[PDB]
């Protein structure tokens, strides 16, 4: 077995190669239809049952389209639904730019929309403008593009996070300079609701915001809004009504201020950021309520800002984070999912509007308002759970209509019982609490807890329900079923399932095996759409009609109705990887992907590149098309590199115990799994040259790339670390404390997990360590690299470095990505793959 040495191209030739191969992947990199919604035609004579609305990209911008769902189909042929544009043609700020980092939005245009069923009113942001159109309500259905109607404003700055009032579709709310405003889209009345922030002041002396999710909640809990409309209006005797907005008010005064380099490099300046680093203060939080009195003809009479009767820290003992919030369907209670600092205790807490009283600096008039609120009105902890690993926040929470006065019925999901995420139907009793506010004491920990009358497991087994990144449930309250996504058939594939929530038993899979599926179920529960792919085939989007057999409504079947997006088709350059697996000495089956070198010569061994992420909340190895985002792994295979990817312990879609393997110990176990899987492949496949292994990853992947070179220089010849964490004390509260705890309670884990404290352990040979980092990174600060370099210089160790001066924790400018790919490919050539690379040692 002699070594294969890759073709040694020049910098200009590699640029040409990469440019040519990028030229046939413009149509691949295009957003599939998403954010689907079904609206019934209610037209017996007409040929269509439903109209579906969705966001899609027809290099075009993201916009609203509709398609017509027929009542009947020609089952011989395949129906391709034509895309009708909903909107006519039209005539970034810092906060848009940051939100797009926090939401991980790579695409341009309309990101989302609201819809009010009763009126047909769409509300959506498009650039700076907030816009509305009407379709599918009492006013009927358009047969041509609608003109977007601008919501006019006197506000000077960007309006963010617009939401339609479900109680009245004439009203919207939005955030402007970190305060809540409302606007009427008919009358054009505009009103500021909160006076908490001053646009003219400096952030160093102006740290309060309202209706806004702060950095940690956007980055670590995927919560981007901080205010929630009450879904129902209270009628007044006058003939008007009261609209309500629950909102979060944040005070970031005690949160540390860091400086991130300003994008305009010519200014030689730096922007201030409230960044809660691990073990330091998170923002001081509380709930508030805006009470908005409207008259008979829609004009604002008054606005009363209201606060909790007692402090947040008293009423919600031990709570750091408001993870989620909303309202019950009738608007009687506001709900909230609350976490403690360690993120090992979750609480679902109902909050009545009667807990809020008007804001009053006058101590006399305030004391009258406190005593006017009854002692029976109190917070109701309807659910509480704990874990020795961590609470993974998700978006599953369904509240049923309130049937009895002193009961609430709901579906929630949890990993706390069995160690896998399953659905549970829960019924909680809303007792009058033991704590009485008149007595003048403080409430004990358990005084707001509700008794659990019923707790039925809807699903179970060694597999999880999916509740993140769009995955959710859909409840059919008529047939008493719940649709959900899960890993029951395979950890490598997501599938749509259905089950009864009254007498749970049979779980019916509604999607076909051999693909992974991301699904949307119609609100009417008679259709679902699946965005699906596999390792060989690019993503497709298809509509499926649901129905029951005549004899049994419980049982659910499906039938292909139409294609929304057809597969682009197998690309001739692209050879996909093979999924492999191996029984680890740790007791788990670990999955991987193998890209064999193209035109594999027998009796020859090839240089290997281990692409790695290896961190929580991600699974790289599954049955999906990897020819868009990981197209360059195939490019590496086409030049003669073996490419390997392994999902080590700690990765997701394998239950909480598997994910919990690296608790307190991040960086210590991951490379063992990677090397084990890499050694499994080498004994099985003699074409893997273990003398020439490279490792490469971004963020957590870059972190592990450094850990690999530090811990196992015997295995890994080169390490290319992209935007790595080199020091856990620099990273934030929400992430670090969840996985690693407080720094003082894990001194050794923080030490061992921080490569910058262990600079002496890196190799004394050069051409083995390449650091890459976006200069403007506000997530993984450039100081991770700068401080690592500082200690490498002190320890006499060599390094290579590439900065991307226009980038944050992402690559958005095309030239940056092109340079990165070019430099990486050239680095691997000169220091791992090529013939000159072998001579260089």
């Amino acid at each position: 077995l002699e070594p294969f040495y890759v073709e040694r191209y020049s910098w200009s030739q590699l640029k040409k190669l990469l440019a040519d191969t990028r030229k046939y992947h413009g149509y691949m990199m295009a957003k599939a239809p998403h954010d689907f919604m079904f609206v019934k035609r209610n037209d017996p004579d007409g040929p269509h049952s439903d109209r579906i609305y969705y966001l899609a990209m027809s290099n075009r911008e993201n916009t609203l389209f509709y398609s017509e769902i027929p009542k009947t189909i020609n089952r011989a042929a395949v129906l391709m639904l034509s895309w009708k544009p909903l909107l006519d043609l039209f005539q970034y700020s810092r906060e848009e730019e940051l939100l797009r980092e926090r939401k991980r939005i790579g695409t341009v245009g309309i990101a989302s929309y609201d819809y009010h069923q009763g009126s047909g009113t769409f509300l959506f942001q498009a650039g700076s403008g907030i816009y509305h159109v009407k379709d599918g309500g009492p006013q009927g259905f358009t047969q041509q593009p609608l003109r977007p109607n601008l919501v006019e404003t006197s506000c000077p700055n960007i309006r963010m996070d617009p939401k339609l009032c479900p109680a009245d579709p004439d009203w919207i709310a939005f955030i402007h300079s970190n305060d809540i405003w409302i606007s009427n889209i008919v009358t054009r009345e505009e009103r500021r609701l909160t006076y908490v922030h001053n646009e003219l002041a400096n952030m160093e002396e102006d740290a309060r915001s309202a209706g806004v999710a702060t950095f940690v909640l956007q980055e670590e809990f995927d919560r981007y809004s901080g205010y929630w409309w009450c879904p129902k209006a209270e009628t007044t005797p006058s003939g008007g009504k009261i609209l309500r907005i629950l909102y979060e008010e944040n005070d970031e005064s005690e949160v540390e201020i860091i400086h991130v380099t300003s994008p305009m490099l010519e200014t030689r300046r730096a922007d201030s950021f409230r960044y809660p680093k691990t073990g330091t203060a998170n923002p001081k939080v509380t709930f508030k309520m805006s009470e908005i009195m409207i008259d008979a003809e829609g004009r604002i009479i008054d606005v009363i800002d209201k606060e909790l009767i007692q402090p947040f820290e008293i009423l919600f003992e031990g709570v750091e984070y408001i993870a989620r919030a909303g309202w019950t369907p009738e608007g009687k209670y506001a709900w909230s999912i609350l976490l403690d600092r360690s993120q090992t205790r979750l609480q679902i807490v109902l909050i009545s509007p009667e807990l809020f009283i008007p804001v009053e600096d006058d101590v006399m008039e305030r004391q009258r308002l406190i005593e006017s609120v009854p002692d029976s009105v109190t917070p109701l902890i309807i659910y509480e759970e704990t874990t020795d690993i961590w609470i993974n926040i998700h978006d599953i929470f369904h509240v049923f209509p309130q049937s009895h006065e002193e009961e609430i019925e709901f579906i929630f999901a949890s990993e706390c019982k069995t160690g896998f995420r399953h659905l549970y139907k829960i019924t909680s009793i809303l007792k009058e609490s033991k704590y009485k506010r008149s007595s003048g004491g403080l409430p004990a920990p358990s005084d707001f807890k509700c008794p659990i009358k019923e707790e039925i497991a809807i699903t179970s087994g060694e597999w999880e329900v999916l509740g993140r990144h769009g995955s959710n449930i859909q409840v059919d309250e008529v047939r008493r079923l719940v649709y959900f996504e899960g890993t029951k058939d395979s950890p490598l594939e997501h599938h749509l399932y259905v089950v009864s929530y009254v007498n749970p038993g049979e779980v019916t899979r509604l999607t076909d095996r051999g693909y992974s599926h991301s699904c949307c179920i119609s609100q009417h529960c008679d259709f679902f759409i699946s965005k699906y792919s596999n390792q060989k085939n690019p993503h497709c989007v298809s509509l499926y009609k649901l129905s029951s057999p005549e004899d049994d409504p419980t049982c659910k079947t499906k039938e292909f109705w139409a294609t929304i997006l057809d597969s682009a088709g197998p690309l001739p350059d692209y050879t996909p990887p093979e999924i492999f697996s191996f029984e680890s000495t740790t007791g788990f089956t670990l999955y991987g992907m193998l890209y064999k070198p193209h035109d594999l010569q027998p009796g020859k061994k090839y240089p290997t590149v281990l692409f790695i992420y290896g961190g929580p909340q991600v699974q790289l190895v599954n049955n999906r098309f990897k020819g868009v985002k990981y197209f360059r792994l195939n490019t590496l295979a086409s030049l003669g590199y073996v490419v390997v990817v392994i999902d080590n312990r700690g990765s997701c879609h394998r239950g909480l115990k598997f994910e919990g393997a690296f608790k307190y110990k991040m960086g210590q176990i991951e490379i063992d799994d990677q090397v084990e899987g890499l050694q499994y492949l080498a004994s099985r496949y003699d074409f893997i040259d273990l003398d020439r292994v490279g490792i490469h990853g971004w963020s957590y992947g870059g972190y592990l790339s450094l850990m690999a070179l530090m811990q196992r220089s015997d295995i890994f010849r080169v390490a290319i670390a992209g935007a790595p964490v080199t020091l856990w004390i620099f990273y934030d509260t929400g992430y670090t404390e969840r996985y690693m705890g407080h720094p003082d309670q894990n001194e050794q884990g923080y030490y061992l997990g921080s490569v910058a404290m262990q600079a002496e352990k890196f190799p004394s040979e050069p051409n083995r360590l390449l650091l890459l980092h976006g200069f403007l990174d506000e997530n993984v600060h450039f100081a991770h690299t700068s401080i690592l370099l500082s200690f490498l210089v002190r320890a006499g160790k060599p390094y290579d470095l590439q900065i991307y001066p226009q980038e944050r924790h992402s690559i958005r400018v095309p030239e940056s990505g092109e340079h990165y790919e070019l430099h990486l490919l050239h680095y691997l050539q000169e220091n791992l793959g090529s013939r000159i690379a072998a001579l260089k040692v």
Binding site: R22, H25, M29, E101, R104, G106, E219, E220, G615, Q617, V618, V628, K629, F631, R632, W698, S699, Y700, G701, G702, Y703, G722, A723, V725, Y731, Y735, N779, V780, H809, S810, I811, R812, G817, Y820, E821
Partner: peptide, 8 residues
């Protein structure tokens, strides 16, 4: 999240 974004 220690999760980078690059789509090409």
């Amino acid at each position: 999240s220690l999760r980078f974004l690059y789509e090409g």
